[PDB]
Amino acid sequence: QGVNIYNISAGTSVDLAAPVTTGDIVTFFSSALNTTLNLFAENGAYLLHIAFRLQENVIIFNSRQPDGPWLVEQRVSDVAGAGIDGKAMVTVFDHGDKYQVVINEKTVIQYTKQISGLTSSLSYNATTVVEAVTYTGLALE
Amino acid sequence: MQGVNIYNISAGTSVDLAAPVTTGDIVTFFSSALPNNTTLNLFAENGAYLLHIAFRLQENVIIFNSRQPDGPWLVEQRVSDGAGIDGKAMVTVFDHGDKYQVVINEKTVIQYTKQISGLTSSLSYNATTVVEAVTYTGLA
């Protein structure tokens, strides 16, 4: 087990020191909660793509291969608190076959993976700085 | 089932967890205030101190201990002594069933062997204003 803090500027990504695999957590802290958060694989594929669309009253989840087309988009109405301090908490559990996304204390989606692989990179897009904390090495034998 | 819980702990007060912390669960305190004496505690229903972390600066040492509700303090564990997230300090704690791994920011500071088992149903922070607490539970 190990904790890793990060600083992700809007429009950029970070290579994780310790990759996120099955049984691992990742939580983004965002004051700015027009925005997307991403879990990228080594081969540049979007394992999980969270897109917050306000003017559309919906949150979007999708996956894209290294050089492929976007896949089956998953939508959730903005209908889905506050967070730690002055910033929302978008958490993501890597459940192996699914990605559980918890916005603050409320679970918002049980996303059936469209692309397997371990997350070794994270990104945050604008539309200024979000932090991320990775809990890894959580699974025993 | 995995769940995230957020708590705002005022200095000198505790919080009843809406989801107890058991084996395989995590808890992380966010404290920008790192007085020479601060403490963080994982409490059990019966008021026992499953884990007591104390930052003694007039001694430059971190102190880890346990105590039964009625009982006296036990084998105190002392640790000699990076930082950054949001001008805070992150004191994370993993419940490993038999031990408590404490991580101050990204550095694991102690592999504390439990002196008292039980599931954490309470948290408190002391010194004198507010430290936040996030629990990742149900990691079953």
Side-chain angles (χ1 to χ4, degrees):
Chain A
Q1 308 72 52
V3 181
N4 282 277
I5 305 90
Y6 297 85
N7 257 60
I8 305 181
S9 280
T12 63
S13 62
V14 305
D15 282 303
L16 296 173
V20 158
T21 204
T22 299
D24 292 348
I25 310 172
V26 50
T27 292
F28 303 85
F29 297 90
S30 174
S31 305
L33 289 178
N34 180 59
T35 305
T36 73
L37 290 175
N38 298 276
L39 295 210
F40 280 110
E42 249 291 10
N43 60 26
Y46 287 70
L47 276 15
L48 169 49
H49 173 67
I50 313 176
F52 298 73
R53 295 170 184 169
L54 327 175
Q55 181 273 168
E56 300 201 7
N57 304 312
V58 73
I59 305 179
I60 290 303
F61 305 85
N62 223 327
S63 297
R64 187 222 289 181
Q65 283 290 18
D67 182 14
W70 272 106
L71 306 172
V72 186
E73 162 180 271
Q74 295 300 165
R75 330 182 78 239
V76 181
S77 56
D78 287 310
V79 167
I84 171 180
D85 47 63
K87 57 187 59 180
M89 273 178 62
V90 176
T91 302
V92 187
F93 298 84
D94 181 354
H95 291 316
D97 64 335
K98 300 178 173 182
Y99 275 140
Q100 191 195 316
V101 171
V102 187
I103 297 177
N104 276 161
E105 295 186 293
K106 178 158 188 171
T107 282
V108 84
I109 196 174
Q110 274 290 18
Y111 186 100
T112 286
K113 283 185 169 60
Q114 288 185 293
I115 313 176
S116 285
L118 52 179
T119 302
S120 60
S121 202
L122 297 184
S123 97
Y124 157 66
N125 210 334
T127 298
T128 183
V129 168
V130 62
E131 306 103 9
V133 161
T134 57
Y135 299 82
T136 61
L138 294 176
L140 308 305
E141 31 55 80
Chain B
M1 189 183 295
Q2 312 69 43
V4 179
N5 291 280
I6 308 162
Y7 310 91
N8 228 55
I9 303 179
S10 239
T13 68
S14 53
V15 299
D16 272 298
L17 290 179
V21 166
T22 208
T23 298
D25 293 340
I26 299 160
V27 56
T28 286
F29 300 95
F30 303 90
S31 53
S32 56
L34 58 164
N36 40 288
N37 290 295
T38 296
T39 57
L40 292 174
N41 300 286
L42 299 202
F43 279 107
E45 275 265 58
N46 51 37
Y49 285 71
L50 267 27
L51 181 59
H52 169 68
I53 315 175
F55 295 71
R56 298 168 182 172
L57 310 186
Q58 76 271 61
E59 304 174 51
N60 189 288
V61 67
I62 305 293
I63 293 314
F64 305 85
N65 215 326
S66 290
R67 195 189 76 169
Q68 284 293 2
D70 41 3
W73 282 99
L74 309 165
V75 186
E76 163 188 85
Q77 220 55 49
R78 324 189 82 218
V79 172
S80 290
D81 206 297
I85 319 87
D86 188 301
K88 313 199 75 55
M90 286 178 63
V91 178
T92 300
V93 178
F94 302 87
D95 181 2
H96 293 311
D98 59 346
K99 314 179 191 304
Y100 281 129
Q101 168 173 42
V102 173
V103 192
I104 296 176
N105 274 81
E106 287 179 343
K107 185 176 197 299
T108 283
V109 59
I110 192 179
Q111 200 63 235
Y112 188 93
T113 283
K114 295 184 178 174
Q115 299 180 301
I116 311 171
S117 287
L119 53 187
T120 298
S121 81
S122 250
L123 312 176
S124 69
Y125 148 74
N126 212 181
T128 327
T129 287
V130 164
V131 47
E132 295 81 60
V134 172
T135 54
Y136 297 85
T137 61
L139 314 188

